[PDB]
Amino acid sequence: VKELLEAGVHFGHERKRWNPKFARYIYAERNGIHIIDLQKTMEELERTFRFIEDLAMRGGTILFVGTKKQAQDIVRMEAERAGMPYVNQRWLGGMLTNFKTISQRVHRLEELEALFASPEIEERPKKEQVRLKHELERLQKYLSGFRLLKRLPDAIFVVDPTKEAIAVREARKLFIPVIALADTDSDPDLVDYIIPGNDDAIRSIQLILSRAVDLIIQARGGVVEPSPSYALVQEAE
Amino acid sequence: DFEEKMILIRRTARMQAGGRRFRFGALVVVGDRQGRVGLGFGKAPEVPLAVQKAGYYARRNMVEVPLQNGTIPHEIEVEFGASKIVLKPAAPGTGVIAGAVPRAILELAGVTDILTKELGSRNPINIAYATMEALRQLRTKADVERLRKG
Amino acid sequence: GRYIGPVCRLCRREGVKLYLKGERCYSPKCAMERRPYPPGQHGQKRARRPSDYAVRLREKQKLRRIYGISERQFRNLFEEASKKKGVTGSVFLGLLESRLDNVVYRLGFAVSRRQARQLVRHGHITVNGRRVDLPSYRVRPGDEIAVAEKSRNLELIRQNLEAMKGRKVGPWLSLDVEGMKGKFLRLPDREDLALPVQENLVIEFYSR
Amino acid sequence: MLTDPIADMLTRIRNATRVYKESTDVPASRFKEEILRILAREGFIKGYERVDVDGKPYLRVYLKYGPRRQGPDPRPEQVIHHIRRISKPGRRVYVGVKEIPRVRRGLGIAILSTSKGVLTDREARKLGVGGELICEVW
RNA sequence: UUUUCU
RNA sequence: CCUGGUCCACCCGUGACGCUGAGGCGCGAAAGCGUGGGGAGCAAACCGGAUUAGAUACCCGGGUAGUCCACGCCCUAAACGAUGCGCGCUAGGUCUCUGGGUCUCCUGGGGGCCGAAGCUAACGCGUUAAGCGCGCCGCCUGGGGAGUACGGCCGCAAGGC
RNA sequence: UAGCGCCGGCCAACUCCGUGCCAGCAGCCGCGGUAAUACGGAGGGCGCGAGCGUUACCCGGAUUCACUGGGCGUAAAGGGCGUGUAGGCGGCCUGGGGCGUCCCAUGUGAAAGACCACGGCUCAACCGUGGGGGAGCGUGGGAUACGCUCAGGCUAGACG
Ligand SMILES: CN[C@@H]1[C@H](O)[C@H](NC)[C@H]2O[C@@]3(O)C(=O)C[C@@H](C)O[C@H]3O[C@@H]2[C@H]1O
Ligand SMILES: [Mg+2]
Ligand SMILES: [Mg+2]
Ligand SMILES: [Mg+2]
Ligand SMILES: [Mg+2]
Ligand SMILES: [Mg+2]
Ligand SMILES: [Mg+2]
Ligand SMILES: [Mg+2]
Ligand SMILES: [Mg+2]
Ligand SMILES: [Mg+2]
Ligand SMILES: [Mg+2]
Ligand SMILES: [Mg+2]
Ligand SMILES: [Mg+2]
Ligand SMILES: [Mg+2]
Ligand SMILES: [Mg+2]
Ligand SMILES: [Mg+2]
Ligand SMILES: [Mg+2]
Ligand SMILES: [Mg+2]
Ligand SMILES: [Mg+2]
Ligand SMILES: [Mg+2]
Ligand SMILES: [Mg+2]
Ligand SMILES: [Mg+2]
Ligand SMILES: [Mg+2]
Ligand SMILES: [Mg+2]
Ligand SMILES: [Mg+2]
Ligand SMILES: [Mg+2]
Ligand SMILES: [Mg+2]
């Protein structure tokens, strides 16, 4: 597991509209970019992953969150591999903090896929019947990955803490650890387990997330598989 | 287990084309008298609904009071808003000497002998918040030692 | 002078059962056995949550009406207890328990505290020989509290000390049913007493 | 100019710890160094060291905090919760050994300045001496 | 433009 | 032409010579006053037209003091940032005026905006603090009566304190 | 011998009748114009009791003159601005003095009263004996960190 000296991707990012609190990870600014201290990026990876195997083998759930477009597709691929839930579209206010409620949305979902498929799928006004097709499409759009969570996660993996701040907030408030690939544009003090590195870039992202899922899969009772997500990194370029 | 004391309930309003639309506010203290206290403030259209929501809220906001022979480790003064609350430890036989709000909180906190004093704005709601805030900053020699070790 | 007036009504108002009488407040009578609710027209309607005042008020009232002592005396005693070394709550109880009338009631010379008061008043009681007739007299540890030689033949005192044959006595007391003598061993503690009282509340009532 | 250097230093420390600095400089003065020694001994700071800045003598004060916390605002608890000047110019404060205040029931401390030297309320109470009540820390 | 009181 | 303040650079000189400041002294928008001069435009008062139930107003036509200058008074104000002065300490971002440097950046002085921590009843403030601190001055202590009455001081008066 | 105040909230104690913004109540909010726990009476009740209640005055609550312990952008409150007298305040290092300050001993701090104990009057009130503490000031001795003062040195403030 792992792979260091990965200047091959991550490191430096974000103009200079930084967050002073992230100075403890910025190596030096060169022609703009602040450039991240890859040494530390490892030191953090060490500790962070350690925490992940922890949950992983222990049979704990992790909610992967990446609304940002740069990692929208990826968040799925990897979260799909590990049997882990995710949020791709838009973080609904209170998914964690108002789980019991935003969960009924999932009950309703299933309840609808059940209605269709065959039983009564065609028994009432084709108008009302197409109205449902909407609820489904919608429910299925926003709950495609949050569908797994049956109880609050043991942790959260965030792609851009700033971008996904409300999520980070609910976690915090509920005492759920926060893991996050975060860089220059953010407050590291809010991340329980940080991974300082390029918050954007499909290439940058893909690497970190993949290895974290390789590591979730491994250390759980299974065998590692190469990520199909890398196909997306190629396509992006 | 927990005991519930009803600190205060107010009626509150809001003008509307058509009439005044009332709502209710209830402050609720929940404690075990073992060093576990909770403050909750919940509103709703009916008193009961409020009071219930209040206790619920209280149970979700507990503080671990470092009791110590019926009293408190040391003196503190906490300012919440324009409200100031002062707590002073006392020997046995003194009783809980304080106004209703800090009292109810202090009693369910399991406190049995304290010297109190409300200063500044005496808004029950803000006084209660300050009492809680105070109980929170309470420390033990242990804690202090722990903090200055190494 | 002391209260006077229907007593098994204070019991009702105070909720708890106060024993302001002898034999009867044991019979299936003492109203708390019949209508265990406050006196008057509204005694049975629902009761509103009492205010912190009401709470402290009643508690004091209760503790005080038990020893059937005035508010004046009751208060002074409190202030004394308050001023001495040691937990006011206990101390206060100790002083009230040291009243001569009470000790005579405690030794069984009298059926009730009221009766005890009258016994002392009519010089039927003696403290270390000399007779004392001050219900408020403070018995100290060591004092022997006997019945008057002259009075030892009073039917009532006979009837009473008779029923005393068998009955035990507080661990701070000692009775000699024989010569109708009793001795004040030590100041009773809060653990010794089993009053339906929350002394913490009474102390608070005077805080205000 | 600095009307009151001691108060100054106490404040630099107060301000630096509120933002969690690691170090922090305060212009060097024997008396200052004396006070600092107590702060260290009492475990309020990691310690300090004489350093030169712009050619002038300062005192790196190595601050220290509690551990990271839970829920929102995981900011560490402070080691120095309170630190306030008492005796001040235009308003001096002197106490006799029997008037030395007991800070937070002893959980806190006070720093007198006696003719037997700068001491904490206890050290002072021990040597049985009083003096200028410099500040209160807890 | 102005344009009171209830 | 005469003259005050101020910023930067070099680090050259003195060696705590500092900060604040009751009283005093000086300055102090407009209107206003005294003497003299000036007077295009504007314009209290005023003289008219109109509007109106009325119009001692708003609109229109005229118009004197005044507005201008010199000298001497007056001293007030939403004289406002409604925020006394000095010093130290506490994230950044962005625009701008002015100086220096190894000048697509750094460094200093100043003017703005967004904001860390923090403060605030809230609005908001936030290295140009209303944050954290020390020094000194001034001032407040419910509303009306009343900035009145009385007394004193000042003023030619109006009137000021 | 048992009385007096109170029962809308503050505040312990509620009902019927009468009355009808009247007559009246009222410490504050307020109550009374036909369903008044607020007026008057009655029944009941709460509080205290040879007392209870009122008026007056002092302290308290009032951190509401804030030393402890407050304030001044918009709530009352920054002086219209400056120059500057008295005064208040004063950077770093060394030395002398020892005025402030700190320490010890000693004198004084009457009695009464106050605190504690024991004791006298059957208790208590009241009173006896004994004990303890006590600010401030005088004198003797000592300390010198800080404030002061004197002498010397510095350059980070200030000025050139
Ligand atoms: C004329 N239609 C109005 C209109 O719908 C008003 N809301 C915009 C609506 O408002 C109400 O619903 C209210 O909230 C109060 C009431 C006075 O009028 C009600 O009826 C009001 C309706 O009568
Ligand atoms: Mg405040
Ligand atoms: Mg006591
Ligand atoms: Mg002081
Ligand atoms: Mg010039
Ligand atoms: Mg030079
Ligand atoms: Mg030289
Ligand atoms: Mg003019
Ligand atoms: Mg003129
Ligand atoms: Mg004209
Ligand atoms: Mg005109
Ligand atoms: Mg002028
Ligand atoms: Mg600037
Ligand atoms: Mg903030
Ligand atoms: Mg701002
Ligand atoms: Mg008045
Ligand atoms: Mg004149
Ligand atoms: Mg009541
Ligand atoms: Mg009438
Ligand atoms: Mg009626
Ligand atoms: Mg009444
Ligand atoms: Mg009535
Ligand atoms: Mg009497
Ligand atoms: Mg006062
Ligand atoms: Mg003050
Ligand atoms: Mg005030
Ligand atoms: Mg004002």
Ligand SMILES: [Mg+2]
């Ligand atoms: Mg000004």
Ligand SMILES: [Mg+2]
């Ligand atoms: Mg001067």
Ligand SMILES: [Mg+2]
């Ligand atoms: Mg000095």
Ligand SMILES: [Mg+2]
């Ligand atoms: Mg001396």
Ligand SMILES: [Mg+2]
């Ligand atoms: Mg003496």
Ligand SMILES: [Mg+2]
């Ligand atoms: Mg005796």
Ligand SMILES: [Zn+2]
């Ligand atoms: Zn009974």
